[PDB]
Amino acid sequence: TVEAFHKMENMKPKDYKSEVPTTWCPGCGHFGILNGVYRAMAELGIDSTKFAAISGIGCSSRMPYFVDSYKMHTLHGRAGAVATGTQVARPDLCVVVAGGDGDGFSIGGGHMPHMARKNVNMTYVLMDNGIYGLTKGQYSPTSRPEMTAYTTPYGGPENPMNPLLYMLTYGATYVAQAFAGKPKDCAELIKGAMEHEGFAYVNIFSQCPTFNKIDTVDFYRDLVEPIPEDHDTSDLGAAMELARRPGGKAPTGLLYKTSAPTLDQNLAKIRERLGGHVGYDKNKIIALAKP
C-alpha cells in the first residue's frame, strides 16, 4: 500500500522543483512532461520523501535531477529493471520511471514485457520523440520510415512499433497516451497512473526541435485524436483497436484499466502462507542440515 499520497496540504507544482536547473533545449517537449509530473504530484499532495523517480539514459532520462524527491539515474534501458528492485524492496514508495523511446523499446525492450506481465505497482512515463536525442538524432523504434536521420541518410529500412499495442499485449493494467503540448492531459493521466495499483504506462509524444525535423509540434497536434468518453476502458480488444490507430490518428486519453494482483502482493502471499516474518527462528532452517 502506497503511503505517499494525500500526505501534504496546499501544495504547488514549484514545491517539487529541485536545485538543479534544466539542461534541455528551448522548445523541447520534455518541459511539458516535467510540468505534467509537477502538477500530478501537487494534486495528490505527495510527500516526496516517499517518491522515487528512476530513469535510464537520454535527454528524457535527465528528468529525475529536476525533481525534488528520491531518485536514480541508472543505465541505458535498465530503468524499469532497477525500478522493480526499488518497488519490491519498499512497497510503500510511489515509484515512477522516466525515459525515452530508444531507452525503452530498443536497449530496454527486453525488460518491458516482464514489468507489465508481473504487474509491478509503478508508473512508466515514456517520452516518445521518435529519435535518439542526446546522441544527436539517430532514428528510433518509433521513427517513421520516410525519415532521414543520423545513421539513416537514405531512410529507415523498417517500420515503427506501436508502444500502446506492445504494452497492451504485455498485459499492462493501465495504458494511456498524451501530448506534451496539452500539459493538463499529461497531469491528469499521470495522476491516475500513480494512484492505480499495477503497472501503469503513459506514452507521451514530445517534440524534439533540435534533431527531429518531421515529428514536429504541428504534426503531433494533428496526429492526436482524443478518446470518446463512451469508450469502455475494460475492453482489452477495444483498447488494442484504439492502439492500432483507426483512421491513422493516435488516441489520447485512457485506453485500458483493470484491477489485478501486483507482484509485491503475490510476493506477500508467499510469506503469509508460510507465516514468515523478520523474526523467524533461523535455527529451524539450520536444523534441516543435521545428518
Ligand X SMILES: Cc1ncc(C[n+]2csc(CCOP(=O)(O)OP(=O)(O)O)c2C)c(N)n1
Ligand Y SMILES: [C]C1=N[C]=C([C][N+]2=C([C@](=O)([C][C]C([O])=O)S[C][C][N]C(=O)[C][C][N]C(=O)[C]([O])C([C])([C])[C]OP([O])(=O)OP([O])(=O)O[C][C]3O[C](N4[C]=NC5=C([N])N=[C]N=C54)[C]([O])[C]3OP([O])([O])=O)SC([C][C]OP([O])(=O)OP([O])([O])=O)=C2[C])C([N])=N1
Ligand Z SMILES: O=C(O)CCC(=O)C(=O)O
Are 106 and 77 a contacting pair, CB within 8 Å? Answer: yes
Q: Tell me if 45 contacts ligand SF4 by CB under 6 A.
A: no
Smallest separation, CB 223 to ligand X (Å): 18
Known binding residue 136? Answer is: yes
In 3D space, the residue among 90, 131, 114, 116 whose CA is nearest the CA of residue 201 turns out to be: 116
Q: Tell me if 28 contacts ligand SF4 by CB under 6 A.
A: yes
Residue 160: alpha-carbon gap to chain centroid? 19
Binding to other proteins (CB under 8 A) within 2-31 occurs at 19-20, 23-26
- Give bridge partners of residue 170 from the DSSP assignment: none
Smallest separation, CB 253 to ligand Y (Å): 24
Q: Tell me if 101 contacts Mg ion by CB under 5 A.
A: yes
Are 39 and 16 a contacting pair, CB within 8 Å? Answer: no
> Pattern of binders to other proteins over 191-210, x per CB under 8 A?
-------------------x
Smallest separation, CB 29 to other proteins (Å): 14
Smallest separation, CB 98 to ligand SF4 (Å): 13
Known binding residue 281? Answer is: no
Smallest separation, CB 252 to other proteins (Å): 27
Neighbours of 20 (CB within 10 A): 12
Binding to ligand X (CB under 6 A) within 182-241 occurs at none
Are 233 and 239 a contacting pair, CB within 8 Å? Answer: yes
135 or 265: whose CB is closer to ligand Y? 135
129 or 173: whose CB is closer to ligand Y? 129
Residue 129 touches which of other proteins, ligand Y, ligand COA, none (CB < 5 to 8 A by kind)?
ligand Y
Residue 209 touches which of other proteins, ligand SF4, Mg ion, none (CB < 5 to 8 A by kind)?
ligand SF4
Q: Of these, 113, 181, 209, 261, which contacts ligand SF4 (CB under 6 A)?
A: 209
16 or 211: whose CB is closer to ligand SF4? 211
Q: Give CA separation, 34 vs 1, 14, 38, 228, 291, in Å.
A: 25, 11, 6, 26, 61
Q: Tell me if 133 contacts ligand SF4 by CB under 6 A.
A: yes
Are 63 and 29 a contacting pair, CB within 8 Å? Answer: no
Known binding residue 134? Answer is: yes
Catalog residues that contact ligand Z under the rule CB under 6 A: 57, 134-135
Q: Of these, 17, 50, 73, 117, which contacts its own copies (CB under 8 A)?
A: 117
Known binding residue 25? Answer is: yes
Binding residues for thiamine diphosphate: 30, 59-60, 101-103, 129, 133-134
Binding residues: 25, 28, 30, 59-60, 62, 101-103, 129, 131, 133-134, 136, 208
